[PDB]
From a paper:
Adenosine triphosphate (ATP) synthases are multi-subunit protein complexes that use an electrochemical proton motive force across a membrane to make the cell’s supply of ATP from adenosine diphosphate (ADP) and inorganic phosphate (Pi). The passage of protons causes rotation of a rotor subcomplex, inducing conformational change in the catalytic F1 region to produce ATP while a peripheral stalk subcomplex holds the F1 region stationary relative to the spinning rotor during catalysis. The F1 region consists of subunits α3β3γδε, while the FO region is usually formed by three subunits with the stoichiometry ab2c9-15.
Three conformations corresponding to different rotational states of the enzyme were identified by ab-initio 3D classification and refined to high resolution. The 3D classes contain 45, 35, and 20% of particle images and the overall resolutions of the corresponding cryo-EM maps were 3.0, 3.0, and 3.2 Å, respectively. As expected, the most striking difference between the three rotational states of the Bacillus PS3 structure is the angular position of the rotor (subunits γεc10). Bacillus PS3 ATP synthase is found in a conformation that has been proposed to allow ATP synthesis while ATP hydrolysis is auto-inhibited. In this state, subunit ε maintains an up conformation and inserts into the αDPβDP interface, forcing βDP to adopt an open conformation (lower, dashed box). In contrast, all three non-catalytic sites in the cryo-EM map are occupied by Mg-ATP, while a Mg-ADP molecule and a weak density tentatively assigned to phosphate are found in the βTP site and by the p-loop of βE, respectively. The cryo-EM maps show that a clash between subunit ε and βTP blocks the central rotor turning in the direction of ATP hydrolysis while it is still free to turn in the direction of ATP synthesis, which could explain the ability of subunit ε to selectively inhibit ATP hydrolysis.
Author numbering:
A (entry chain c7), B (entry chain c8), C (entry chain c9), D (entry chain c0), E (entry chain c1), F (entry chain c2), ...: 2 to 72
K (entry chain b1): 7 to 56
L (entry chain a): 6 to 131, 152 to 191, 198 to 234
M (entry chain H): 2 to 53, 58 to 67
N (entry chain G): 115 to 228
The structure:
Amino acid sequence: SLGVLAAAIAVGLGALGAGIGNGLIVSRTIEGIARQPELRPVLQTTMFIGVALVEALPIIGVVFSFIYLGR
Amino acid sequence: SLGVLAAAIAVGLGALGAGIGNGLIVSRTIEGIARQPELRPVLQTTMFIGVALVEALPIIGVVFSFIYLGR
Amino acid sequence: SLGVLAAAIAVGLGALGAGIGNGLIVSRTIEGIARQPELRPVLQTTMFIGVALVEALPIIGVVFSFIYLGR
Amino acid sequence: SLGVLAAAIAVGLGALGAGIGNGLIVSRTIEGIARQPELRPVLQTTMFIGVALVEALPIIGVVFSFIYLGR
Amino acid sequence: SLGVLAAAIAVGLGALGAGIGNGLIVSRTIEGIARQPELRPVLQTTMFIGVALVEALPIIGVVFSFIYLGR
Amino acid sequence: SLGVLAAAIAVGLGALGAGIGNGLIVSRTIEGIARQPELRPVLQTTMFIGVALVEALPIIGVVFSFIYLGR
Amino acid sequence: SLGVLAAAIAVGLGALGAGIGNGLIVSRTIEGIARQPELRPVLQTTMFIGVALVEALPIIGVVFSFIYLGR
Amino acid sequence: SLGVLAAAIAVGLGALGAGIGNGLIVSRTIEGIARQPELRPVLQTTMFIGVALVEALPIIGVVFSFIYLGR
Amino acid sequence: SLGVLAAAIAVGLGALGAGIGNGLIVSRTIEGIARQPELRPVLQTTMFIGVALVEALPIIGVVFSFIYLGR
Amino acid sequence: SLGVLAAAIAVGLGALGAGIGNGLIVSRTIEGIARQPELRPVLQTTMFIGVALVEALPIIGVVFSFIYLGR
Amino acid sequence: SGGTIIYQLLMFIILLALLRKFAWQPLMNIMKQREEHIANEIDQAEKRRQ
Amino acid sequence: PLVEFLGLTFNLSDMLMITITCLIVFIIAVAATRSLQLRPTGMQNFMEWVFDFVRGIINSTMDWQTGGRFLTLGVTLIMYVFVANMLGLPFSVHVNGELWWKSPTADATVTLTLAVMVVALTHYYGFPLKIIEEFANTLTLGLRLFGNIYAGEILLGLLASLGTHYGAAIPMMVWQAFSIFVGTIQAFIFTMLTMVYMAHKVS
Amino acid sequence: KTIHVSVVTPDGPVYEDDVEMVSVKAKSGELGILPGHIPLVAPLEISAARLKTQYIAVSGGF
Amino acid sequence: IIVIGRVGLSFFRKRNMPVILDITRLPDQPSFADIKEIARKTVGLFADGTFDELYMYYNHYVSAIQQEVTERKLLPLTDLAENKQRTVYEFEPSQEEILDVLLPQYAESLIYGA
């Protein structure tokens, strides 16, 4: 019964953390390509590895959310 | 009974995280085009790219909340 | 029973996310028009586009709150 | 029973979101009028429409809290 | 039974929102009068209309928390 | 029985909001002190009326918390 | 009964608010010493009275936590 | 029987903390490589050890959540 | 019983507040000794007294959590 | 009974606070070594004593979580 | 038969009508800008050589 | 709205939507590529504009010599995902059975196998932390497109039922314009992140 | 590594050497300069320039 | 009119024209101090909102024989030319404050070079 709510807070807090982290990274790379627009690939690759990190910990959280759901 | 507010906290924390991330990205885009108007097409392009990236992981929380309401 | 509490926290977290995101983007566009006052229409049009794209997910949170209230 | 707790948590989260968002908008517009004080009416009209948005989504949050209290 | 806890979370979240909003407004106006000292009356009038403007919805949240305590 | 929890969270949320608001206003008023010394009286008068503004709602919160504990 | 966790959540939210406020004000005293290290007496005395201001309402909250624990 | 809820709030709060910390670190390091490009490798190594710290505390949080759900 | 939940919560919010406050004070003293390194000992010593000042009250919350676990 | 989620909320709030504070410290140390690269060892040594100073209290929160789980 | 099908299809048609009054003028001008740009690149190239 | 499968192994309706989107993409491709014209007009300029758009994206991520190969995978991938997102909006019919012909991308298995096909291709053309990051980016790409189409599908459907059961034209109109916006943005971020991982593994 | 200082007046050059630490103070506050510093401009207050030693008092100053 | 010299000062007093600033009896080899006080008065008098633009008039040393007369626009700095390596700085208070303190010094250096 409570495993549904457990999976739900897990995916909700993972979504909140990934949203704030991705928002910070892409925000400052907007102002990075606005200050110096010729640095777009060297900003972009580091942006995507940061997106990979800040999603990949909530991604293993949301992978664990289904085994929270089952129990 | 408990799955309803499970789905509700899931979609609520998703909306919170997407709102903060979208706010950070869009605010920095418009201050960047306020710094110079000559790059507003590429900054709007990377704006919508960023909005998709921060609105992506909360909507998987939304559809998982529908799954939680299913069970 | 729990559906009205579900509906209320869903619309409340949607209001919190939309309020923070709209506050960020509107505050940066008014400091942008304070920095360069001849850029006011472009800045406020991109600001209203930002209002729509930060209030995308809270608005769907509102109608899913009505779903949660109905059950 | 739960309807009054629902109505109050909706009003509380809407008040917190409106407080933070309108605080950001009003704070940045008084520092913007501190930078260039000849732009008083433009800054005041833009802060009024921005505050109108940031308040008006918790306004419908508050009237939804009223129909939550009715149920 | 839950009406007292409802009024409590309502007044508390309205207090936290009003605290952060008034902190932002008074903080940016105190750095604004720290920058241009001869702009003190205009900055104070806009600051007080901003403080009333951001505590508009928390005080109606308080006077709705009273009837939440009743109902 | 939950009136004690109600009063306690009212005091706690008021303390948290007052702490953030006073932290913001005191922090950049000492930034304003550190930039220029000669405006210490006007910075401190605007500081303490800001303390009054960000603490007033909190004060109301703790009085209403005693009303809630009496209920 | 649940007055023990009432008292504890009062202590916790007072600690969170005092931590954020004290962190902001003492951090920007460090930033002001870094900008200009010859006004350390006036910066530290305004720091400590701001510390008194941010700490005051959580200490009032924690003595009411003592009156809450008993009940 | 609340170990599933235990492990899930542990993973969720660890994911939120790791998301905000990684977002701050990666966002400031892409601003660091944006304002000057010629020591991107110097910035990346300290960025990755900071990511290692701010996730290595929630990694042991996730392992402790596994032994929470085991009990 | 529920005093364990009380003590843990006090310990957790004390750790969260101390973490954010200590992060602010240490991060801004990194920037402070990064811009002017010849000042480093005096601002790191007032950083340490700010550290003791920001974590004074969470240690009090830890002691009160021992009291709550005893109850 | 509820000692397992007591242990888990302790670990979760400690991880969230350590994540935010550690992210602030590491982000400011990489922008510090970005804007002037010659102070990398000094800034890393004070960054490491700062992160040890931050995570001192969540680690004792984790061992208090151990004795909460044993309860 | 269900009622939602013709209802949302009718409003999709009237949404395409509103987007036709609003939107045929931008994208046809973008396509005409691309066509005139590539015709001038080619036309210019042909003219100069001659 | 259950999973209607005529065969036990695989969903029948998803196969129908995959076949209809493959045929409509193939016929718009051969209608845009009818004949050779050195002065572009009509729809051949549109196909060349999409072609140079994909090329521009490749040029943003990688060197043109390395990524020149991927251009014809990328253009059919962006057009395929584009039409696959926009098919769910006009009809979305309900039959007396479980469900028939919603959209392909709303099915989670379709989008997850398309994402793992993308990553299998970029492994084919191309230590525990790296492989868990690989499985992380596969499932977050698939879940990205699946969620951001499936939530809009359910909302549009809900709006359709609220209108038919008992005045509510403009909310679903604003949502449906926002949903074709979500469809084109999701197609573009899908093909762009595809080319990002292709550039990350090639060079 | 060292950085190259050259204090320049309209009347002519005054000082030119290689100094490790330059500790000028701006209108905002102090600045401690090491080799590899970010490109920045800051107006100097009417005070001495601490070069680590020889101290140079500038007037006007930028 | 802002004269530097007694010959132009007596010229515009014979012809009854208004002369605000006057500086008289410079050395043969002038340093930056005397022209610093009168150039500070000139640029600050532009900053008061009085002049709204001003021009310089002097003899450009082309050669030992030529000495051509140049009209050069001092303020506003509209004809400012870009250098070879356009680099970006980190403006330490902000760029507007450093311009507020730096552009009068650029105008004073223009006056002293002329």
